[PDB]
Amino acid sequence: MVKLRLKRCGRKQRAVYRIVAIDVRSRREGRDLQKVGFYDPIKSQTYLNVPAILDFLEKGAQPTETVYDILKRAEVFKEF
């Protein structure tokens, strides 16, 4: 399926990452149905948009490694 994954969105030596739920066959910087999330590893926030991640994980788009690790920081996981 769809695989919720980051994409690099920034300058050189910056690493401002989006969390996009695109199809896994696409290149890493493509297009999404809905670009759900944010991750700034230098130091800043991470907007998550919980209902849409629950929509796609409720559908069954498995995430990658560190997207899943961000999803294990917060308490997003509910099986409903």
Partner RNA sequence: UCAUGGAGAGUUCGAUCCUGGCUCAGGAUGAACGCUGGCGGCAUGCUUAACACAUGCAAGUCGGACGGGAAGUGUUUCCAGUGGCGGACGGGUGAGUAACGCGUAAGAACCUGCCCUUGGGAGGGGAACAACAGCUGGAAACGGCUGCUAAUACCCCGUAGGCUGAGAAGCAAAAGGAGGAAUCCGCCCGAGGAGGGGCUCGCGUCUGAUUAGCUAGUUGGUGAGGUAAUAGCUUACCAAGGCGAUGAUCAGUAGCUGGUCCGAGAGGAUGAUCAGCCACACUGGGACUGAGACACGGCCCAGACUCCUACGGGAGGCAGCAGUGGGGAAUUUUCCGCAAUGGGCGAAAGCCUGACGGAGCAAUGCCGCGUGGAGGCAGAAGGCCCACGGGUCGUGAACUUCUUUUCCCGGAGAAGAAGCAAUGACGGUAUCCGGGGAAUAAGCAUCGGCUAACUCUGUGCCAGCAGCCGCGGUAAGACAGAGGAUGCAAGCGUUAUCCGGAAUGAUUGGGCGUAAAGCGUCUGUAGGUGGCUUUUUAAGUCCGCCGUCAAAUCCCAGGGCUCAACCCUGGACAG
Could you say which of 53, 65, 75, 76 contacts RNA (CB under 7 A)? Answer: 65
Q: Is 78 in the site for RNA (CB under 7 A)?
A: no
Cβ of residue 62: shortest distance to RNA, in angstroms?
Answer: 5
Contact predicate 64/2, CB 8 Å: no
Q: Does 74 bind RNA (CB under 7 A)?
A: no
Sequence-distant (6+) residues with CB within 8 A of 65 are none
Interruption sites in the chain after residues (C→N beyond 2.5 Å): none
By CB under 7 A, name the binding residues for RNA: 1-3, 5-18, 23-33, 35, 38, 41-43, 47, 59-62, 64-67, 69, 72-73
